[PDB]
Each structure stands twice: as structure tokens, then as C-alpha cells.
Amino acid sequence: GDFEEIPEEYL
Amino acid sequence: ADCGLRPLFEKKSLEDKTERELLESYI
Amino acid sequence: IVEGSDAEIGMSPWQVMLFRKSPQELLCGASLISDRWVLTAAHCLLYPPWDKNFTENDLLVRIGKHSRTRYERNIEKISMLEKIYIHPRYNWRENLDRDIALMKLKKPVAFSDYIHPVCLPDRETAASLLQAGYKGRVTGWGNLKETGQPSVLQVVNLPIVERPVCKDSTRIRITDNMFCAGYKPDEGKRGDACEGDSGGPFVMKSPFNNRWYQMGIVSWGEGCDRDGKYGFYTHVFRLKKWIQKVIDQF
Ligand SMILES: COc1cc(C(=O)N2C[C@@H](C)OC[C@H]2CCO)cc2nc(N[C@H](C)c3cccc(Cl)c3)oc12
Ligand SMILES: *[C@@H]1O[C@H](CO)[C@@H](O)[C@H](O)[C@H]1NC(C)=O
């Protein structure tokens, strides 16, 4: 994916 | 109370580069 | 946004990205109207003809952003949805009449240099500013042309268009809950929203009080930036009774 990974807390 | 006033613009009395184009259209 | 330019830092601090989880992608634009309420277009969340039917747990709200794809650590804030409210008379079948939805966030978002709500118009603000020829501003991370994607948030300023001209540009029935904007073919300037910009704000800066008001929501256009076509926007003031009702109730 083109999107940078988000912190795991938000998932 | 403080809606629609941008910290980096209105709050510091700085204008963005194209807001005057908007103003100039408001007769 | 087609034929726009890069936003300045903090230029649109009410801008919200609706971000899909799994698979990680831009779902739509939106706008921050308070510390717990986000405004968007209903068709961003529910549109049966394209099999769109997102629930609260399917997406995130990303506020304070500039870069499209980067995780903007210490700048952007990411919020979870508590609840989605779609207008009960949203007409997805026919014309996208009342293309409006609200979302309540799980927790209040902290305001900062990059994160700040836009004002909603009242009747008087609508009457003053929603006039043919008066320009507003459209922001988003959608496609740069019809048929690619920006590195940072894009801005374009566009004139409101006379209602008969709007109607004569399309086969779709245009209601009093919609307005259109964009330049005509002669004018020597261009620009439009495009795929991924829906649900974002059309804003105007009141010359009376120097505040920014969200007058429109990016709804739809036939293609993007075509000569003789215009963008259609949800008329926020006309739907404000509903907005106030959802917020006062919930
Ligand atoms: C279901 O959502 C959409 C549908 C269509 C569609 O193809 N439409 C409309 C519908 C009311 O009627 C059917 C048929 C008519 C025009 O082809 C076009 C759409 N464009 C968008 N969003 C993009 C960002 C956009 C582009 C330019 C200007 C603006 Cl304001 C917005 O969402 C659309
Ligand atoms: C959308 O999904 C909800 C819950 O998942 C369901 O109740 C609703 O009927 C669906 N609407 C559609 C597919 O139009």
C-alpha cells in the first residue's frame, strides 16, 4: 500500500 | 466561539496566498 | 482536485481525511465542525449502486493532515467513530439530494495549529455569500485528473454558478439543497474536485467577520474538470436544521 503504516493503537 | 479562525492565519493576522481572490469576488 | 495547487501549512485546519482500514486507502474528505463532530457527504458512507456501506468500525478520521500518505507524527490526530448519522432523506437513488452525514468521534480532538473547526452558516450568512460569481474554496486529497494522486493536500478556488446554468449543464434534477460551482469554458481558469474529494468542504471567508464558513459539501460532478460541466455541492445552510437536530439530540 501507498499509505504509511499508522500506529497499532488506532487499529 | 472561535470557529473559522485559523491559528496560522487569522489568529496571527497573516493572509494565505489566494484568500484575497475570494474577497475580490465578494461585491 | 484538478488544476489546484498545494495547500499552505495550516491553511485548512478543519480538513478531515476519512481513511479506510483494511485496505488502507483514502475514502473521502470531511470537515471538523466541533471537537467531537465531523461532517461529510452521505455517499462516502452509503451508496448501494457502488456497494458502499461503511460501518463505524470500518474507518478512521485523520485530522490535521497535509501529506496524503505519511503518518504525520505529532501533527495529525487519528480518531475513532462512535456513531454515523446519515440524513434520513438522503436520495442516493436519483440525484444525491441531501448528500450529508455526520460522525461523532469517540473522544474529543485537541485543537492545535493544524486542527481547528470551521463555522457553519446561519440564514444571514447564506444570503450574503451564496451568490453567483462569489468564490469559495475546495480542498482535498482526491485525484489530480479524471483518468494521478497528490503528495499533499490540494486547494482550488471556484465561483458559484447561476442556478439556470447549473441545471442546463446536466440531465440530473438539481434541487434547492444543492448548488454548483466552477468556471465556464470561456473564462481562462479551470479547476474542480475529483475522485476522493467528496465529503470535503467548500468554504468561504466572510468579509463581515473574517471567519471561514462551510457553505458546501463536495458531492458530485460528471467526470472532473470537463468544459461545460460544474461540481455540485450540498447546501449546508439548507440542511442545518437536521445538523442541529442530530447534535442537540446526541
Ligand atoms: C455517487 O457519487 C458520485 C456519482 C457520480 C455520477 O456519475 N453521477 C451523479 C449522480 C447524481 O447521477 C448519476 C451520475 C450523473 C453524472 O454522470 C459522480 C461523482 N463524482 C463524485 N465525486 C467527485 C469528487 C466530484 C467530481 C467533480 C465535482 C464534484 Cl463536486 C465532485 O461523486 C460522484
Ligand atoms: C448497510 O449495512 C447495515 C448494517 O451493516 C444494514 O442494516 C443496512 O441495511 C445496509 N444497507 C444497505 C446495504 O443498503
Residues of chain B positioned with their CB less than 8 A from the CB of C155 = 18
**Which architecture characterizes domain C15-117+241-249 according to CATH?**
Beta Barrel (2.40)
Ligand nearest to the CA of C56: 2
Cα B22 to chain centroid distance, Å, stands at 9
Chain C: give the shortest CA distance to residue A2, in Å. 7
Nearest to C65 by CA among C80, C78, C76: C76
Distance B25 CA to ligand 1 centre (A): 27
Ligand nearest to the CA of C233: 1
Residues of chain C positioned with their CB less than 8 A from the CB of B19 = 205
Which set of grid coordinates corresponds to residue C79?
Answer: 480518531
Which set of grid coordinates corresponds to residue B17?
Answer: 496566498
What 3-state DSSP class applies to C29? strand
Judge whether C116 counts as a catalytic residue.
no
Cα C240 to chain centroid distance, Å, stands at 15
Q: Are the beta carbons of B10 and C11 separated by less than 8 Å?
A: no
Q: Are the beta carbons of C133 and B27 separated by less than 8 Å?
A: yes
C132: number of Cβ within 10 Å: 15
What 3-state DSSP class applies to C169? coil
Q: What is the 3-state secondary structure (H, E, C) of chain B?
A: CCCCCCCCCHHHCCCCCCHHHHHHHCC
d(CA C150, CA C182): 20
C11, B6 contact by CB (below 8 A): yes
Instruction: Give the start-to-end residue ranges of the domains of chain B.
Output: 1-27
Instruction: Output the CA torsion B20→C72→C82→B2 (10° steps).
Output: -30
d(CA C196, CA C223): 12
Residues of chain A positioned with their CB less than 8 A from the CB of C19 = 3, 6
Q: What is each CA distance from C135 to B22, C16, C55, C74, in whole angstroms?
A: 5, 22, 35, 33
Whether B1 and chain C come into contact, CB under 8 Å, resolves to no
d(CA C50, CA C194): 17
Per the document, the length of chain C is 250
What 3-state DSSP class applies to C126? helix
| CA nearest ligand 1 atom 32, residue | C220
Domain B1-27 bears CATH identifier 3.40.50.2000: no
> Which atom in ligand 2 lies closest to the alpha carbon of residue C48?
14
Q: Which amino acid is at C101?
A: A
d(CA B4, CA C206): 10
Q: What is each CA distance from C225 to C43, C133, C192, C212, C213, in whole angstroms?
A: 20, 18, 5, 25, 24
C153, C68 contact by CB (below 8 A): yes
Q: Are the beta carbons of A4 and C69 separated by less than 8 Å?
A: yes
Which residue's entry shows cell 497573516?
Answer: B14
Of residues B4, B25, B26, nearest to C118 (C-beta)? B4
Experimentally, how was this structure solved?
A: X-ray
C184: number of Cβ within 10 Å: 15
